[PDB]
């Protein structure tokens, strides 16, 4: 879908006693399972996408809250952006005492009707003003025949859920270990888009996974001036960009209210609230003072207008991988401007890969920025993983240093090791061989930070303290490697350290 | 600057290491000082960062009444700056220690993610480290294996990960260290994939134009038997045009202390272009691009030209 549309998601639990207070074991509880799910996807969505909408609803309860079509349904929460007080409302109903806390309020086991329940949720999504990209309902019921004993009750539901799917709201399901069996082919076969224990999907809602997730958006758009005249529009996209702990919002102590940092500039002698025109900019050199205006400290540092000018072609081997400037950015075509320029770009991509070549360019991302120099290395897609595109096809902008960047480094000379000293090393290295994958690690600080932040947010008992994956697991490095550190200590240097 | 440390492949075995930054995206030494327009003195301005509560200009005192918060969904939660430090992830040391090794294949070009590059060297006058580290990197020169390493410059600073990538020069072994992404620094998008070419046709005559462009506009010419091409435009040897332009203005405004600013001095364009013989080669292969490919419009925007003379 288009950029702005929120994900929006409504959670809809069976309040019926026959599942709600029920267990075959003692070790879980289907309502305590669903409520855990709702709290846990919701705490995922809080860290990861505060912009996307959640609601939660109980059907078949005995005391009601709805706009209309009231009987035996209670909207615990209408659609809203997610936060702490909503997670505290769900927390109240959890656990062995929780399954009594709920009973003092909304009441349990009464008759219900899916064609009314699906009506209610529909009205909910309608009532909200925002643009929605995905509209999804989640069923937390075990009741595999949903009391369609009256087939002329049940045909209402099936038609109404035809009407859900027809209006482009989706609906989705989880089965919840009903004693002895559950089978979708009896009923729910036509409500969703051979026999089950409990859903292999449901564990994915307990991943508790944390990052920002920020959708595909351009960094900027530019014209690749091949010369004085021929241009194509290309996008500039950010495939790799270091995340930061979110900017902290300064607060008033006594009320927790936000407060305005309200900076001014004041003459050291006198009451002049000096305006931006009152003051210049300056330097000191050679015991004299150089004076420039607030226009020209940024008229200096201009050279060009926003574009990419072609500088001719190179071998890919001469672009030496030791000197690297800043993270590489992707280039991909954009018919939003310069229509049909995709036809040129695609031929340019295809044929550079045959030539074993890069294009060299001068790059300005904005007006009032100096040109850097950038090699456009061409790119090719590994769809072989059943069209999981690990690599999009296009170009990489790889940046190149200038003289000033390549800092001087001290004198040293040696070519010291013998073939035995390499030969022992060639063993330890081959014993320590694993497979790195790009996603195999996580930031120890930024992951810890969210766990501290949750403890403070919910008033939990404890910070979760989940230990990081960057420390070497040194006992495994002792054992897999084995004792071979002694080959350095014996064969390579004296015993004095 | 010098930094002393201890390269550590396993719990018992440490080698002395002292790295130096090698590429750094370089910034000018002296900042633009702020000065009063008529007195020309750099201390007649005080910068009051005053505060407001919005209840009709109740002005706060930062030393008593302002406490940082973070943001958590639809609501704010107060920390204390003095209690983030109680709970913050603290590194146990100023560490450098290898996690393991794996092929050049595990580490593609694109992903490299650093502010800087280190060159990571055997400590000065440690002849035991010199033999041990020359063994280390000579044992990486031949397997195509690379290292993966936890790093940290100093205490309190963030822990760090990534690729310690070896290379060779006749006078010393290279093993640079570079940072690689964590799982949340990496963005995955399915860009609509271009080999499905049926709506964006690359026809025989278009391909047969481009076939000559990318050989014709070559900078690297084969005037050699070393298998190294002429390196006709050595961009890493060029000085930064940002600083040439800055000092050139500071010169002109020093020698002519009330006059307006000059154009870009022309030899800077002559250096920063890539012009000479390559433009004499290009013009004809470019002339067949103009016809075999379409070039539909783009808009233009204006400047001080929107009200400037003649």
């Amino acid at each position: 879908y288009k950029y702005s549309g929120r994900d929006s998601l409504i959670f809809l639990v069976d309040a019926s006693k026959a599942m709600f207070e029920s267990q075959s074991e003692d070790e879980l509880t289907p309502f305590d399972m669903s409520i855990q799910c709702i709290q846990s996807v919701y705490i995922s969505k809080i860290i990861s996408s505060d912009r996307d909408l959640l609601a939660v609803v109980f059907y078949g309860t005995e005391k009601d809250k709805n706009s209309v079509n009231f009987k035996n349904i209670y909207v615990l929460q209408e659609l809203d952006n997610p936060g702490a007080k909503r997670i505290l409302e769900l927390d109240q109903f959890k656990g062995q005492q929780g399954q009594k806390r709920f009973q003092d309020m909304m009441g349990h086991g009464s008759d219900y009707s899916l064609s009314e329940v699906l009506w209610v949720c529909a009205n909910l999504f309608s009532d909200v003003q925002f643009k929605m990209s995905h509209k999804r309902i989640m069923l937390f019921t075990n009741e595999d025949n949903p009391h369609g004993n009256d087939s002329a009750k049940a045909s209402r539901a099936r038609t109404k859920a035809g009407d859900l799917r027809d209006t482009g709201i989706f609906l989705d399901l989880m089965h919840l270990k009903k004693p002895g069996g559950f089978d979708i082919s009896l009923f729910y076969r036509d409500i969703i888009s051979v026999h089950f224990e409990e859903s292999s999907k449901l564990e994915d809602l307990l991943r508790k996974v944390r990052a920002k997730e920020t959708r595909k958006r351009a960094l900027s758009r530019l014209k690749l001036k091949l010369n004085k005249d021929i241009v194509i529009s290309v996008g500039i996209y950010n495939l790799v960009q270091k995340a930061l702990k979110p900017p902290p919002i300064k607060l008033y102590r006594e009320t927790n209210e936000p407060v305005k940092t309200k900076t001014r500039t004041f003459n050291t002698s006198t009451g002049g609230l000096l305006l931006p025109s009152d003051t210049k900019r300056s330097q000191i050199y050679g015991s004299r003072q150089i004076i420039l205006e607030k226009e020209e400290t940024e008229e200096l540092k201009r050279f060009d207008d926003p574009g990419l000018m072609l500088m001719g072609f190179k071998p890919l081997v001469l672009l030496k991988k030791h000197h690297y400037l800043r993270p590489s950015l992707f280039v991909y075509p954009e018919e939003s401007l310069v229509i049909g320029s995709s036809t040129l770009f695609s031929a340019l991509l295809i044929k550079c890969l045959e030539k074993e070549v890069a294009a060299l360019c001068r790059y300005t991302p904005r007006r009032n920025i100096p040109p850097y120099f950038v090699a456009l290395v061409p790119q090719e897609e590994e769809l072989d993983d059943q069209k999981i595109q690990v690599t999009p096809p296009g170009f990489q902008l790889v940046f190149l240093p200038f003289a000033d960047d390549k800092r001087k480094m001290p004198f040293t000379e040696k070519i010291m090791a013998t073939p035995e000293q390499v030969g022992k090393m060639k063993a330890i290295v081959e014993k320590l061989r694993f497979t790195y994958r790009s996603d195999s690690f996580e930031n120890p600080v930024l992951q810890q930070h969210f766990r501290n932040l949750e403890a403070l947010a919910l008033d939990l008992m404890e910070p979760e303290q989940a230990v990081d994956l960057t420390l070497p697991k040194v006992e495994a490095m002792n054992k897999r490697l084995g004792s071979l550190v002694d080959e350095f200590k014996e064969l390579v240097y004296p015993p004095d350290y | 600057i010098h930094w002393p440390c201890r390269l550590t492949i396993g719990s018992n075995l440490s080698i002395r290491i002292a790295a130096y930054k090698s590429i750094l995206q370089e910034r000018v030494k002296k900042t633009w000082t702020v000065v009063d327009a008529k007195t020309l003195k750099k201390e007649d301005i005080q910068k009051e960062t005053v505060y407001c509560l919005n209840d009709d200009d109740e002005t706060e005192v930062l030393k008593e009444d302002i406490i940082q918060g973070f943001r958590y969904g639809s609501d704010i939660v107060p920390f204390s700056k003095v209690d983030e430090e109680q709970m913050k992830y603290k590194s146990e040391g100023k560490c450098f220690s290898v996690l393991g090794f794996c092929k050049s294949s595990q580490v593609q070009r694109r992903f490299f993610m650093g502010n800087q590059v280190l060159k990571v060297f055997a400590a000065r006058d440690d002849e035991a480290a010199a033999v041990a580290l020359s063994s280390l990197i000579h044992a990486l020169d031949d397997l195509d294996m690379v290292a993966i390493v936890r790093y940290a410059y100093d205490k309190r600073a963030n822990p760090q990960v990534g690729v310690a990538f070896p290379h060779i020069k006749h006078n010393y072994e290279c093993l640079v260290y570079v940072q690689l992404p964590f799982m949340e620094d990496l963005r995955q998008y399915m860009f609509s994939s271009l080999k499905n070419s049926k709506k964006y046709a690359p026809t025989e005559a278009q391909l047969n134009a481009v076939d000559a462009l990318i050989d014709s506009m070559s900078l690297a010419k084969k005037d050699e038997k070393t298998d190294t091409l002429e390196d006709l435009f050595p961009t890493t040897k060029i000085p930064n045009p940002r600083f040439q332009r800055l000092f050139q203005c500071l010169l002109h405004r020093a020698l002519h202390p009330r006059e307006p600013l000059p154009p870009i001095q022309q030899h800077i364009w002559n250096m920063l272009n890539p012009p000479a013989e390559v433009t004499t080669k290009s013009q004809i292969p470019l002339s067949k691009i103009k016809t075999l490919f379409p070039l539909i419009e783009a808009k233009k925007k204006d400047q001080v030209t929107a009200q400037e003379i003649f």
Partner: peptide, 23 residues
């Protein structure tokens, strides 16, 4: 389609479970 797309956060590609060094 389903195979790579997360149920917690749709359209976005499924976050695999952190890994690390393991020979």
């Amino acid at each position: 389609r389903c195979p790579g797309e997360s149920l917690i956060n749709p359209g976005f590609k499924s976050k695999k479970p952190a890994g690390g060094v393991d020979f």
